[PDB]
């Protein structure tokens, strides 16, 4: 289970038994000339080895200087530090003189000798943060923008708080941060698991070490699955210390003195059992059960653990009314106008294109007025309109999250967007935007053929050389602010009393009230619909009018909120009080409220208050991706959600590890860099010792990126044999050995990697040249888990579609399992760490169906034998091991069939399907995911990506002829029908997870109907009975029979 490569032990029964290393080049030459600029004005040039340490270079320099004129004007070598300009154009003092030349990221091969001012050395080891982020801190210090500089100052609250929580019951609190418990969501053990246990008991194996010790000692135990680590410790010490010389009382006393000097560790990885949970709840224990394994734990002295924890010791960083009461928005007596001035940088053929105009609209998620363009004036050849555009919306009815979305267009109906840009009508301080603005625009994305793009990010594109469009917002001779909460609350109380006195009735008849109309439990109906099933105007009016009854059905809220007329402050002010104390709702549902359809701050604040209550560290690291992504739709840098995620990250180092990488991953994406670097900076400043660990992971990956870059350009048209020598030569160099040798795997930080096994390292056959790497597991019980650790580093593929799909698979597995139906997916580990750069978990003992077929299959090549997979499997599992191998295969295959059909991944054939020796089947290399390759045609495809060819059908009905017709196949068809139905009762969760991914620049997810595949595939508009038939129909047609 990343623990055991998901290897099942079928016998085991419990009831028995270009700009890389220097500007221009990738790899500095092994010998290099360096200019040393001396503080005496001389330049001596050293011939250095590429891997020389600054300690060595300095020493050589001050020996050579003696030979040039002006020597005695020099101090002792010790009185000095190197500085140089680095590849990000910043002069950097080199404090850590144990760094190697090839690792400073120079630009020019030259070093300047200086004596160190900025005298706070400590503070300037602050390049560490910038290294981990991939941009120097001083870039932030320079950013004029008040929002930015307010975020840096204001976020520190969160930092100081978290640092407090850690140092609470220190050291235990610290241990609990660095090594949080790995734990299932519920203690209630699913029926299928309980049952591998013989009426609730596991054999476990507690190991121990005294002197030296090259001797370790088993103490096999048999305890209830639900008995805590403390109990388990007692029982080992009890076993270990019984003796003929100790009485019974005396034994009990010795157990008391020892019980709590110890804690439990998983042998082989860096996972501990530091809190009270049933043993069964720890994910290792549960994995061992599923896999037919005996748990191996270790008894660790608390001190020798506290020993490996160092003080984190956080430091506050160096960077430590209005217009006399201001004027309220609700007073401005006018409609809205915006003046469009000019564009500068439009690129168009006067020949191909007739004309250009600016298309504009006011939006809150979707729009609050008549959309409107300016005349087609002086088109192409120097674009100038000088128009006030006139929107029909009064200024007081602008909601807090109002946006302007503009786009420059071409024109019988040539309607085509050239560039697009969006602005928040209010700023981070609630100030209505006034005066002049320059907006740099964004390029029309792959997918979007629409005219306007309000999903896109708010703010100016930070590429200077883009269509810049100048703008002019009105002026009301004062800075205008959005009203106080208390002001809005009175306006709502007023509106309410005011309704209570009418008598005529129109559409939104806000009028029975006093009783319910009873059949008017359309409300409980509307409530259950998934988020993608559009609501009709009658229903919108309806939910509004029964807004107060909706409090009875808390989870109706998403739909209520879309029934509000956000261009009506009367309505919005009321919604505000309603939200103020709506019952909080399950997080699987709050999370919709954080997508791009719900930008109001009060609504999102609610969502976060839900999460704060209900979301557990287990379920949070499950959704961490969607949570990070959703930060893009937050309007401003300082928002309640960032505070929440940040405070968890600094409070739980497993969450923080993945928070760091997900952010770091997207640092190239300019639509998010500034936001994410800032966030990363807080984190790094406060995460504590982990920074040092991150810096190491980061040092590794840059080495891997730089190395594969050389292979991919400049070492092709070379044979693999040539490439491989180059590879190995390079990893032998000291800088690489050092960089790539003792660090935590970014795929799972509980896995130490150190000591590369170069003989087990290769370039896989793929044209992208992925690196197959293999590391010694340095743990003192490697043996007991896995001696070698292997992961793949791939440079060239965008890993985040795969990443998402695997996450979906993991979530499907859980839904099925925890409902007691046992389908076995293998969501292997995938992590994007860059622009098209990533790590894929390796799974030992798995083979492409194609290989299986290639190994077994006779002399003369003609046709491939359908039975061979089955043969291959029989050979791997003789006996009654067989019957369970066929069961695993039946089950995984059933799972990977339903998930595949629902998600509509790429076509499955003999080399994206994989089998394990225990007979577990799993997919790899998903291609696109919502039938994206229907960007052409598609139109009601709903393809079956996983067709069971004879090969598979044979295996399922142990070896029958005419498998279509057996009991096993009925058994299978039943798991299929049951799993499809299970995932369908959780459709909302799945849609919401895709919604929150519209952010990410993922060509497969650009608009809510990219996502609408899922409704078809899960027959959401039908009754479940009909859906069952739909599903059978679908399977019937792809297989041509079988399913009726």
């Amino acid at each position: 289970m990343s623990y055991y490569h998901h290897h099942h032990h079928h016998d085991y029964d419990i009831p028995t038994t270009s700009s890389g290393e220097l500007w221009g080049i990738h790899l500095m030459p092994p010998r290099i000339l360096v200019e040393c600029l001396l503080p005496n004005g001389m330049i001596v040039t050293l011939e250095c080895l590429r891997e020389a340490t600054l300690i060595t270079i300095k020493h050589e320099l001050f020996k050579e200087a003696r030979k040039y004129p002006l020597h005695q004007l020099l101090q002792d070598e010790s009185s000095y530090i190197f500085v140089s300009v680095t590849q990000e154009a910043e002069r950097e003092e080199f404090f850590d003189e144990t760094r190697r030349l090839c690792d400073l990221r120079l630009f020019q091969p030259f070093l300047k000798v200086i004596e160190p001012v900025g005298n706070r050395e400590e503070k300037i080891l602050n390049r560490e943060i910038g290294f981990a982020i991939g941009m120097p801190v001083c870039e932030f210090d320079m950013v004029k923008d008040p929002e930015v500089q307010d975020f840096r100052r204001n976020i520190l609250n969160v930092c100081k708080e978290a640092v407090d929580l850690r140092d609470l019951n220190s050291p235990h609190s610290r241990a609990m941060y660095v090594y949080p418990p790995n734990v299932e969501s519920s203690p209630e053990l699913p029926k299928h698991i309980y049952n591998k246990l013989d009426k609730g008991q596991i054999i476990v194996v507690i190991w121990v070490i005294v002197s030296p010790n090259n001797d370790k000692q088993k103490y096999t135990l048999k305890i209830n699955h639900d008995c805590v680590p403390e109990q388990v410790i007692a029982e080992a010490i009890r076993k270990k210390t019984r003796s003929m010389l100790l009485s019974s009382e005396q034994l009990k006393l010795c157990v008391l003195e020892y019980q709590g000097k110890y804690i439990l560790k998983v042998c082989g990885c860096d996972e501990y059992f530091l809190e009270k949970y049933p043993l069964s709840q720890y994910k290792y224990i549960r994995s061992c059960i599923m896999l037919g394994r005996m748990p191996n734990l270790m008894l660790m002295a608390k001190e020798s653990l506290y020993s490996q924890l160092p003080m984190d010791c956080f430091t506050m960083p160096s960077y430590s009314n209005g217009e006399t009461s201001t004027k309220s928005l609700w007073v401005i007596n006018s409609a809205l106008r915006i003046k469009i001035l000019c564009a500068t940088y439009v690129n168009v053929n006067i020949r191909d294109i007739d004309k250009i105009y600016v298309r504009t609209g006011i939006y809150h998620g979707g729009e609050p007025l008549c959309d409107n363009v300016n005349t087609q004036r002086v088109p192409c050849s120097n674009p100038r309109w000088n128009e006030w555009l006139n929107y029909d919306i009064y200024i007081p009815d602008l909601p807090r999250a109002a946006r302007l979305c503009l786009s420059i267009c071409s024109v019988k109906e040539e309607h085509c967007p050239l560039a697009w840009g969006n602005i928040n009508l209010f700023d981070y301080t609630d100030t209505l935007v006034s005066g002049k603005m320059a907006l740099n625009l964004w390029p029309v994305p792959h997918g979007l053929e629409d005219l306007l793009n309000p999903i896109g990010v708010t703010g100016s594109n930070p590429n200077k050389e883009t269509p810049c469009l100048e703008l002019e917002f009105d002026w009301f001779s004062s800075v205008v602010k959005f009203p106080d909460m208390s002001v809005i609350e009175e306006h709502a109380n007023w509106s309410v009393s005011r309704e209570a006195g009418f008598s005529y009735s129109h559409a939104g008849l806000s009028r029975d009230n006093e009783l319910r109309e009873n059949d008017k439990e359309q409300l409980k109906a509307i409530s259950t619909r998934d988020p993608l099933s559009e609501i009709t105007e009658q229903e919108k009016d309806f939910l509004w009018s029964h807004r107060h009854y909706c409090v009875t059905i808390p989870e109706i809220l998403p739909k209520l909120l879309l029934s509000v007329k956000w261009n009506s402050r009367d309505e919005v002010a009321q919604m505000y009080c309603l939200v103020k104390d709506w019952p909080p709702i399950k997080p699987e549902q709050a999370m919709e409220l954080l997508d791009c359809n719900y930008p109001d701050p009060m609504v999102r604040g609610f969502a976060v208050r839900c999460l704060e209550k209900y979301l557990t560290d287990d379920k949070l690291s499950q959704y961490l991706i969607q949570l990070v992504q959703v930060l893009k739709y937050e309007q401003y840098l300082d928002n309640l959600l960032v505070r929440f995620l940040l405070k968890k990250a600094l409070t739980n180092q497993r969450i923080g590890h993945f928070f760091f990488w997900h952010l770091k991953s997207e640092m190239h994406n300019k639509t998010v860099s500034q936001r994410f670097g800032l966030l990363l900076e807080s984190y790094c400043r406060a995460c504590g010792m982990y920074l040092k660990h991150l810096n190491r992971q980061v040092e590794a990956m840059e080495k891997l990126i730089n190395l594969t870059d050389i292979l991919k350009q400049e070492k092709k048209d070379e044979t693999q044999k040539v490439q491989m020598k180059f590879l190995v030569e390079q990893m032998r160099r000291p800088d690489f050995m050092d960089a790539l040798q003792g660090f935590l795997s970014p795929l799972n930080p509980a896995h130490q990697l150190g000591n590369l096994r170069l003989e087990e390292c290769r370039i896989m056959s793929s044209a992208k040249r992925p690196l197959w790497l293999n590391w010694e597991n340095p743990d003192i019980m490697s043996e007991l888990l896995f001696q070698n650790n292997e992961i793949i580093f791939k440079n060239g593929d965008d890993l985040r579609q795969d990443m998402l799909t695997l996450q979906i698979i993991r979530i499907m597995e859980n839904i099925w399992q925890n409902q007691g139906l046992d389908l076995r997916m293998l969501p292997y580990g995938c992590l994007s760490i860059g622009d098209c750069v990533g790590l894929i978990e390796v799974v030992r003992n798995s083979h492409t169906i194609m290989q299986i077929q290639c190994k077994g299959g006779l002399k003369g090549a003609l046709q491939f034998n359908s039975h061979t997979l089955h043969q291959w499997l029989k050979d791997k599992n003789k006996g009654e091991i067989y019957d369970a191998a066929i069961d695993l295969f039946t089950r995984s295959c059933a799972g990977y069939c339903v998930a595949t059909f629902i998600l509509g991944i790429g076509d499955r054939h003999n080399s994206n399907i994989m089998v394990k020796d225990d007979g577990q089947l799993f997919h790899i290399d998903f291609g696109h995911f919502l039938d994206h390759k229907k960007k052409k045609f598609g139109y009601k495809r709903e393809r079956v990506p996983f067709v069971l060819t004879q090969d598979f059908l044979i295996v399922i009905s142990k070896g029958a002829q005419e498998c279509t017709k057996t009991r096993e196949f009925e058994r299978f068809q039943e798991m299929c029908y049951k799993a499809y139905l299970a995932i369908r009762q959780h459709a909302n969760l799945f849609i919401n997870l895709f919604s929150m991914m519209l952010g990410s620049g993922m060509p497969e997810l650009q608009s809510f109907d990219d996502i609408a595949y899922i409704r078809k595939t899960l027959a959401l508009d039908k009754t479940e009975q009909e859906a069952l038939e739909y599903f059978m129909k679908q399977m019937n047609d792809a297989h041509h029979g079988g399913w009726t």
Partner: protein, 268 residues
């Protein structure tokens, strides 16, 4: 009349509505079947710039209506009226008409080639061109992205070049201080070899400037082609739309006369 109705597509589910209402404007409209009869009867869908507005048509006592204005003795009855008038009188914030009946059965173009088989051959021609176009577009979209990053690397290099030049100018300044502080002594041996250092230093500051310049000259060269890609991108984009939109109509006029849902994928 009722099955024809021109704007009535019946059994299309929520999706192929928005997908047939994608990228028109103002007041466009069309009628649907409701999803459950434990829901409603028919759905009028509007368009209001990117936003799709859904209106329920209820059918009870022979009467068809949105709400209580039930007098409207047909489905086909109720629509006509609102193609002439606004929906605002039913519910306030609905100040649009059904002016754009866009549902025209796509016999307007499609060369009217009654063939079906010939109409399908066109479908393939256009669909290849489309894909050819989508790839050119895609190739260009990527060249653009690379070129953006390559420009910005060139910008920071230019900066790093300047920074370097400062450190070196500073350097032959620094020295003049301590250098011409020793030139005072009689010893012109040492002076000569202090001149050598000084003269390595300046022709180096020459070389470096020669190298920044050389790179600024390539930033323009790049900024040029960058402009070019944008030009050509905006020139494909409108073509990729009408090619794409004519491929939707040929696919309609086909599945108008005779579904054959499965046969189509040969021409795609």
């Amino acid at each position: 009349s009722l099955q024809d109705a021109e704007w009535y597509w019946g059994d299309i589910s929520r999706e192929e509505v928005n997908e047939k209402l994608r990228d028109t404007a103002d007041g466009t409209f069309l009628v649907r079947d409701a999803s459950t009869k434990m829901h409603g009867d028919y759905t009028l869908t509007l368009r209001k710039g990117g936003n799709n507005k859904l209106i329920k048509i209820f059918h009870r006592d022979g009467k068809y209506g949105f709400s209580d204005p039930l007098t409207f003795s047909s489905v086909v009855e109720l629509i006509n009226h609102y193609r002439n008038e606004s929906l605002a009188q039913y519910n306030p914030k609905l100040d649009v008409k059904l002016l754009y009946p866009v549902s025209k059965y796509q016999q307007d173009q499609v060369v009217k080639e009654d063939n079906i088989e010939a109409v399908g051959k066109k479908l393939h021609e256009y669909n290849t061109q489309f894909q050819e176009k989508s790839r050119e577009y895609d190739r260009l979209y990527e060249e653009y992205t690379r070129t953006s990053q390559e420009i910005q690397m060139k910008r920071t290099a230019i900066e790093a070049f300047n920074e370097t030049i400062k450190i070196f100018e500073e350097q032959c300044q620094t020295q003049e201080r301590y250098s011409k502080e020793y030139i005072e002594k009689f010893n012109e041996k040492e002076i000569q070899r202090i001149m050598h250092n000084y003269d390595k230093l300046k022709s180096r500051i020459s070389e470096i400037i020669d190298s920044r310049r050389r790179l600024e000259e390539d930033l323009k060269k790049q900024a040029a082609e960058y402009r070019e890609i944008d030009k050509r991108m905006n020139s494909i984009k409108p073509d990729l739309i009408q090619l794409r939109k004519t491929r939707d109509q040929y696919l309609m006029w086909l599945t108008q006369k005779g579904v054959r849902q499965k046969k189509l994928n040969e021409w795609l």
